[PDB]
Amino acid sequence: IDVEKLLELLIKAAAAEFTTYYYYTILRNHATGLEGEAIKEIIEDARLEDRNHFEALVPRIYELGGELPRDIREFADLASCRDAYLPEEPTIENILKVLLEAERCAVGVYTEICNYTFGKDPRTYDLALAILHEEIEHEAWFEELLTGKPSGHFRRGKPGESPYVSKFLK
Amino acid sequence: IDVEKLLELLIKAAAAEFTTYYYYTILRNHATGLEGEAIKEIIEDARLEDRNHFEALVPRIYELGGELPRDIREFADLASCRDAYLPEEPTIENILKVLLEAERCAVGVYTEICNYTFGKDPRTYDLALAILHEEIEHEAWFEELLTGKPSGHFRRGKPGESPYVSKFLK
Amino acid sequence: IDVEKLLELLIKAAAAEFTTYYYYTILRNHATGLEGEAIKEIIEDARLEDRNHFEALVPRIYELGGELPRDIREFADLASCRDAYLPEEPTIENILKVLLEAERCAVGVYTEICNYTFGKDPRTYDLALAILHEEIEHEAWFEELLTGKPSGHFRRGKPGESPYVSKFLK
Amino acid sequence: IDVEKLLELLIKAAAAEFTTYYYYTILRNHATGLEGEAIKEIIEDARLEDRNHFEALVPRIYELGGELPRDIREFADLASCRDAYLPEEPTIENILKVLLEAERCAVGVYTEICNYTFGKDPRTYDLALAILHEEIEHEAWFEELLTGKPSGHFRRGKPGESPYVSKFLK
Amino acid sequence: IDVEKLLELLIKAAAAEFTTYYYYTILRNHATGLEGEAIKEIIEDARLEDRNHFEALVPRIYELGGELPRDIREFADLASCRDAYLPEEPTIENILKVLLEAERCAVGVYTEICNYTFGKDPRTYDLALAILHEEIEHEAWFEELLTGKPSGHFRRGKPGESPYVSKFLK
Amino acid sequence: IDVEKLLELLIKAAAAEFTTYYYYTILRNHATGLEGEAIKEIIEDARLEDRNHFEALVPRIYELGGELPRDIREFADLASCRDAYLPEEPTIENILKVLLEAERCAVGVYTEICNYTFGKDPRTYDLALAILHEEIEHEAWFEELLTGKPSGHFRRGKPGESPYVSKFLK
Amino acid sequence: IDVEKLLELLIKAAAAEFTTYYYYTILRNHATGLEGEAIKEIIEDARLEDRNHFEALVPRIYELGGELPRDIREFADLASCRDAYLPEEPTIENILKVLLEAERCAVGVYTEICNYTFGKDPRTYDLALAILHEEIEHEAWFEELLTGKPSGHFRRGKPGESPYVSKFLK
Amino acid sequence: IDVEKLLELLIKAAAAEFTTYYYYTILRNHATGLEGEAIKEIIEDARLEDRNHFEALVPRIYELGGELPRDIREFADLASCRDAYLPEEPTIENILKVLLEAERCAVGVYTEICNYTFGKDPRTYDLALAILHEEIEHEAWFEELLTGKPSGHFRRGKPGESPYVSKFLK
Amino acid sequence: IDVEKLLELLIKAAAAEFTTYYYYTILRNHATGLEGEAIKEIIEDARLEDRNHFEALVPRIYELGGELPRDIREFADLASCRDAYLPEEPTIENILKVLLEAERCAVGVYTEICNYTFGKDPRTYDLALAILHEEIEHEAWFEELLTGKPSGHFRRGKPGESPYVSKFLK
Amino acid sequence: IDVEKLLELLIKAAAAEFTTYYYYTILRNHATGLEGEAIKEIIEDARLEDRNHFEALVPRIYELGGELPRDIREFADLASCRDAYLPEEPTIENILKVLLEAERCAVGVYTEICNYTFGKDPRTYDLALAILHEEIEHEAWFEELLTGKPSGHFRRGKPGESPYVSKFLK
Amino acid sequence: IDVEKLLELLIKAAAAEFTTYYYYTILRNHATGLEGEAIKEIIEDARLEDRNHFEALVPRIYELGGELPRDIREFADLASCRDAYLPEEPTIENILKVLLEAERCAVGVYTEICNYTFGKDPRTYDLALAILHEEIEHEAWFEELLTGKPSGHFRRGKPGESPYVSKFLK
Amino acid sequence: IDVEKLLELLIKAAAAEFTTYYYYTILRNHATGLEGEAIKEIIEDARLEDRNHFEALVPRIYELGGELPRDIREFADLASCRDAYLPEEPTIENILKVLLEAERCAVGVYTEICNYTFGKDPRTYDLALAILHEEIEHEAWFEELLTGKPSGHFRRGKPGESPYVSKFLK
Ligand SMILES: [Zn+2]
Ligand SMILES: [Zn+2]
Ligand SMILES: [Zn+2]
Ligand SMILES: [Zn+2]
Ligand SMILES: [Zn+2]
Ligand SMILES: [Zn+2]
Ligand SMILES: [Zn+2]
Ligand SMILES: [Zn+2]
Structure with a gap:
């Protein structure tokens, strides 16, 4: 593997997660009303x-x-995903579409890293797989709220418990 | 009491609970959308x-x-209640009606056992009473979601904690 | 059973418990001195x-x-028991008599409900029995402090833990 | 400060909290249906x-x-706020308006006490401030459910934990 | 009910439990070897x-x-059951027979009390029922170890937790 | 990968686990006597x-x-494994053979899924690997009880804790 | 050391503890009134x-x-201490004297065992010392309640926690 | 504010707390008898x-x-309060008077510091207020035990938990 | 108070905290060697x-x-404090100076907000005071590591427990 | 005491414990079958x-x-006990004899150290006594499994909890 | 033993511990800088x-x-050890020497008490031994920080847990 | 795969871990002084x-x-790594070099096993990967203490918690 090429892929992924933390704060506060209380x-x-x-x-x-x-x-400016801006018409449907678009881009980012490190860098592969578990979870959540396709998941116990990546955390 | 008659009533009740566990898994996964997230x-x-x-x-x-x-x-094939099949038009209202029908049949099953063992079999009576407590709870839940009649109950703390039958569990 | 007659008996009992919560607050604050510290x-x-x-x-x-x-x-105004007013001479003996009188009325209220629902309404009977357990406890407490008759009970671990009615609580 | 004037302000506030506990029990049981399950x-x-x-x-x-x-x-009869009666047409919108009206009166009550005791009675001021924290929280909750104005708050962990007034509780 | 007759039945039952605590200590220490380690x-x-x-x-x-x-x-000398003496030939089979005999006598004692107080003394009936739950458990344990008849029970979590009578304990 | 082919392999595996839960209940209750108490x-x-x-x-x-x-x-009828029926002569040795046969079939089922998804479906591969961990554990348990070959494992702390698949559970 | 002589001293001590458990139950239930609530x-x-x-x-x-x-x-009949009978005039002072007499006899029993095993039987000496710690505690408790001599101890946290002999318990 | 003047007020207050810890140890050990057990x-x-x-x-x-x-x-020698010596006649009433005198001096000390730092030193003001909360608690305790004036407080859960100053402790 | 002026002061403070979280991650990873292990x-x-x-x-x-x-x-770009860049010569002394400079600016920011809201906005004042408690703590930490002036603080139990602002957190 | 002589006795004891940890791993894995599951x-x-x-x-x-x-x-090579080799015929009886032989040698080792340090080295004596407690426990375990002599002990709660030496552990 | 002579030895030891608590507070606050952060x-x-x-x-x-x-x-003035004053030149080495001197005096104090009560006062001997355990620990800590001699100890879990004297504490 | 070749690689790895446990005990006790307290x-x-x-x-x-x-x-004698002997000049730098050398050999051992079992033995591959996670952690720790290269890790919470291999432990 090219270490320089792998390093630039990991830094871009880290930038996307950092900016996502800021933009999701705005989206949460604008999901108001009786319908928005659920989401x-x-x-x-x-x-x-x-x-x-x-x-x-x-x-x-x-x-x-x-x-x-x-x-x-x-x-x-190095983020691999586009910014999740608040839509001009902030209705529940338009907020849901922005969230779904961000999740599908994250799934593609970590799928690409796994293909690059398969059978060559065991530790980097395992970390990318753990994050990909939770991204696929989030994608199924929003597609079931927007369309009618069943997903198989319901409410978690406590937000941010992250059962797949905990062993990597301090 | 006739022990043979009591035994056949208890085995039929156990079959209904076992099949209910399978069919409710299908019903949960099809309660989609914004309205279904609540239930x-x-x-x-x-x-x-x-x-x-x-x-x-x-x-x-x-x-x-x-x-x-x-x-x-x-x-x-020995279950005392009819199978809770997924309705042909799986809307939220039709799913709620199937759940309500299953609950009212369960209340009748355990009411019948209590009448049979009243003052004759103290241990069997106590177990039937404990399950009847929780079945009456579930019946009031669904009738309040379908009609507008108040019930007096709201969300539990943790699913499946079963506060009335715990002393019978290992 | 007459549901209307049973409903009016349960509402009157609930009123007595609600007013008892207010009046016992006054009685606790007036049990002063070295003798009152115990009770x-x-x-x-x-x-x-x-x-x-x-x-x-x-x-x-x-x-x-x-x-x-x-x-x-x-x-x-619907309470089935008389108000536990603070006595005109608020000594320790006069406070104890007021508490004993209130407890014996509560025991009679729940004994009457059990006779009415015996073998006819299993869920209502079980709830009335659970409360009657704790009322008999309180009656024995005060009669031992006022007279010398032994009761068989001593201090609880934590106030308001209610070991008999917990399974009915959220 | 006039202690007699301060005492009559505190007793009236305590009466409002005591009656609010009774009336909110009725309002909760009438918020039925799919929409009411959220609130x-x-x-x-x-x-x-x-x-x-x-x-x-x-x-x-x-x-x-x-x-x-x-x-x-x-x-x-000494309560500083009007009774939160169940509306004649008990719909979700009419229940929400009654709750919002009660909360805004509570905010005014405790704001008045803080102005009276500022820099003169340190212990009374601190207790009034702690309760005012939670009243402002409740006011923002209901105004966001009725109108569309963002509030910045979402679901608590456990009802009645009261993080601002706990140090005053036993 | 005759209170004097009920009192003499309860005192005799309490004597049997007190002596059983002493005799079971001897029986436990003599169940040696590889076979006795299980029991x-x-x-x-x-x-x-x-x-x-x-x-x-x-x-x-x-x-x-x-x-x-x-x-x-x-x-x-008032115990309602015979003393569980250590057998003259202390083998595993002879110890098991002594334990089974003691358990069947206990089941008969508490069944008799329930018949006497049925529908007349609600608090005494409930306590007798709770103990009868655990005695029937012990009887099924030993009969399955001695004969081959299935019982439906296996090892508890912690000895002496007593899940049926805990609400009566301090 | 063919998603339709992968889906039919996963549904058949789920059927085997569901029926195994029913049949193992019968096998546990028939392992009686002093020898059966261990297993x-x-x-x-x-x-x-x-x-x-x-x-x-x-x-x-x-x-x-x-x-x-x-x-x-x-x-x-879609289960990938044969039913674990109670043997005609229900001795300890014959029960052990039935359990060993069921476990070896489960190991083959999940080994086949891992080969199919290796390097193509990261999330499905990880879930199949987690279950395969616990199936290999169970196979070594029974082969050591039936033959004399050492296995390297002893008693767990609490049944059903499932240390390898917990992060997939709610 | 003579093992036979040591064995007869330990069996007599065990008999005293067993009978003390029965007699203290009677003494506790007769300490009634406002004064007895403390003890x-x-x-x-x-x-x-x-x-x-x-x-x-x-x-x-x-x-x-x-x-x-x-x-x-x-x-x-082998107990090394006299029976703690309920006094003919069961007042608080007479109950306290009976308790004090029993405690001083227990201190003498375990002091004698320590002298016998000092520097000869390390395990028996350590166990006798641990029990002697708690007996001296109880003796100081009652002598301070009966006379006015200070003792240096106040209320424990939970009855029967036994901080000195816990390492010998299962 | 004059920092030197504020520093000398805080050091004198710290000396009073340090000596109070020593003198209260003597007072506790001399509160003997049945009456002293309460306090x-x-x-x-x-x-x-x-x-x-x-x-x-x-x-x-x-x-x-x-x-x-x-x-x-x-x-x-720098303590702002007089030493709480053991009275020459150590009766329960004389011990209570010494404790009450010490508490009223502590309330005056911390009231003076709050007036000095009001609106000028926010961190010093908050710490002085927290300690003043608990001193007012102790003053009400002893005045209710000595006189008959109601106070509104009863027994704590665990000594030294200090619910108002915990956030300042390590 | 001018709400618009207060709002712009709070948004600038929030920006400083958000950027501080990013820059402190870089500073921690460059405090290497034996000396840096402490800090x-x-x-x-x-x-x-x-x-x-x-x-x-x-x-x-x-x-x-x-x-x-x-x-x-x-x-x-709205942060009220300058960016805490990694120094050109990243030694332990130069890192410590950057940290000290950032902390003193934070103390000034929250002192200014308290002066603006004193006696006018009780809820905003209390929140600003809570954060000011922890900023003064951090300032004393670094000045003691850089100079020799005593501070009075030592190691916390668990990082990020924040004992002063917890009641504001979810 | 001779410190050099005491040091060589402690190092030899530590070597025996270190090698025992390795050899007991082999013995555990070879105790197979239905009989070996118990031990x-x-x-x-x-x-x-x-x-x-x-x-x-x-x-x-x-x-x-x-x-x-x-x-x-x-x-x-400095161990004070012989190596616990796996017997040539690894049956349950031969494994039990090897374990019993190792335990009796350990009891002799620590008895010798206590005699040497009695009344001369208080800290070394206390540590040797604590280990001797647990060695006597293990000796009684194996002699009861091999012969029929009663021992007075049964299963622990959690392996390796070591209730006698915990205060010496970190 | 002479009780008067033993009493004067115990009071002098208690005075040393009380003053040590005050002087160690000053020493901790003056151990500044990068080197002092460790100690x-x-x-x-x-x-x-x-x-x-x-x-x-x-x-x-x-x-x-x-x-x-x-x-x-x-x-x-009755303390058996000299006051641990802050040295005139408060460097890390001079602070360490003062701490080492205080610890060696404490070891001598409790060694003397054990010799006096050996085999005569079992309870006083056990308490003196427990404190001597922790004093020897502290002496080894400081001598390893000052000289290079190995000690065998490293950081505790939580300060003041006192694993040897806990059973004597309330 | 050749099972015999895989078995000899796993036994050699287990020998290295067993001897490392002994040698690291010596290295820890010789890291003395102010500098060694950190490591x-x-x-x-x-x-x-x-x-x-x-x-x-x-x-x-x-x-x-x-x-x-x-x-x-x-x-x-079968260990795949050289013994980590205490250096002749036991300074902090020489101890650090020995630790770094041992860690790099462990990383090579488990990297070799993963290459051998990739896509052929799923259970053996997963276990080798889990241990390789923690070995890479230790290598980065020591290289940052010896050189100045940043590593990205700081102090753990509790030693030996092993977050990557816990699911394999009992
Ligand atoms: Zn992410
Ligand atoms: Zn059911
Ligand atoms: Zn309120
Ligand atoms: Zn029993
Ligand atoms: Zn104070
Ligand atoms: Zn050992
Ligand atoms: Zn000390
Ligand atoms: Zn390793």
């Missing part, structure tokens, strides 16, 4: 998950010999 | 309760000298 | 018990098709 | 909070030299 | 249960107006 | 494990676009 | 301690090659 | 509170640039 | 504290009628 | 105990001025 | 230990018939 | 980890049909 807890659970993903990725970057960029504005 | 947790709580009822009934059957049928298909 | 903890335990009894009775009233009165003053 | 847990959380506020106010009244009125009907 | 834990569980039964019966005797005999030797 | 706890641990495996498989089936069959009898 | 908790703590002492002594007797007597009446 | 637990609770107050004050003194005196005898 | 835990504790401060400020901004800026880069 | 848990408990004994002895050796040998093979 | 936690652990030793000694003094001196200044 | 806790954490690795490897060896060597000296 407030689901958004909160997803937002705390992505903060934990940022925590897990940083130590692996430094083990491989990389470093974070000096200035925070340069870090935000 | 997913209530269905899950009821499904875990009926699994515990099956656990409590089996030891009493063997104390009285009975046994379960050899083949599982013969056991399913 | 302060016993009064506190009894007061928290009766609050739990009010919590358990309300859901059963709504299951049977009843409702609470609109105005709170009309609810207070 | 049942919020009403329950608010009702348990106001019971704790009554518990905290009573000891301070006796420290300052006051006492509760002898008869419970006279206590109910 | 040591079952005997220990039963011995701790009967100590709890003695604890529960004493307060009810004093509530009804009775008292324990002055001298401990007179108390031991 | 009762091991059978109980295995039975609770397979119930958890059914819980983990169902959500993944719905994520991939599958569904459970409508009728429960059709579900039972 | 009820102290008697309860001492009674549970002596039950634990009986539990600790029995295993050591069997290690040294002794056994308990066959019949329970012969065991009671 | 032993209250004195113990107050003594542990004042030890915590000393712990909280020391870090703030060093933040502001002060230091403790070199020799411990000079520290004891 | 790694202190930096980690401070970094988790400032994340909690961001969590507490956001709900109050929305209660007052404000909102966060749309784009994350605009939010970062 | 697997007892061997596991003893093996974890001896690991804790090695942990406790090492700090005391360094306090007295000793050190461990440089090479691990020289350490193994 | 702050060790000093804190030792200071909390000596407070517990004072708690354990006081009850034994009153059991033997002694009392504390009336005035606190007379108590401080 | 004592890190060495302790690593030593407890390697003991857990030995526990996990032994059961897998017996599942595959292998066994441990008869004599412990032959087991020690």
